[PDB]
Amino acid sequence: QFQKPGDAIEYRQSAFTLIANHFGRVAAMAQGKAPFDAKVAAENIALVSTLSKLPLTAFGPGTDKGHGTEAKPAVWSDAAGFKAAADKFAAAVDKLDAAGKTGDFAQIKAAVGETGGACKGCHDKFKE
Q: Which stretch binds its own copies (CB under 8 A): 22-30, 68-76, 95-103, 105-113?
A: 22-30
Q: Which does 113 bind (CB under 5 to 8 A by kind): its own copies, ligand HEC, none?
A: none
22 a known binding residue? no
Which amino acid appears at position 43 of this protein?
A: E
Extended strands (E) in 1-128: none
Neighbours of 66 (CB within 10 A): 10
Query: How far from chain centre, in Å, is Cα 23?
Result: 8
Residues 6+ apart with CB under 8 A from 121: 85, 88
- By CB under 6 A, is residue 17 in contact with ligand HEC? yes
Give binding residues for heme c as ranges: 12-13, 69-70, 119, 122-123
Binding residues for ligand HEC (CB under 6 A) = 9, 12-13, 16-17, 19-20, 23, 56, 69-71, 75, 85-86, 89, 115, 118-119, 122-123, 126-127
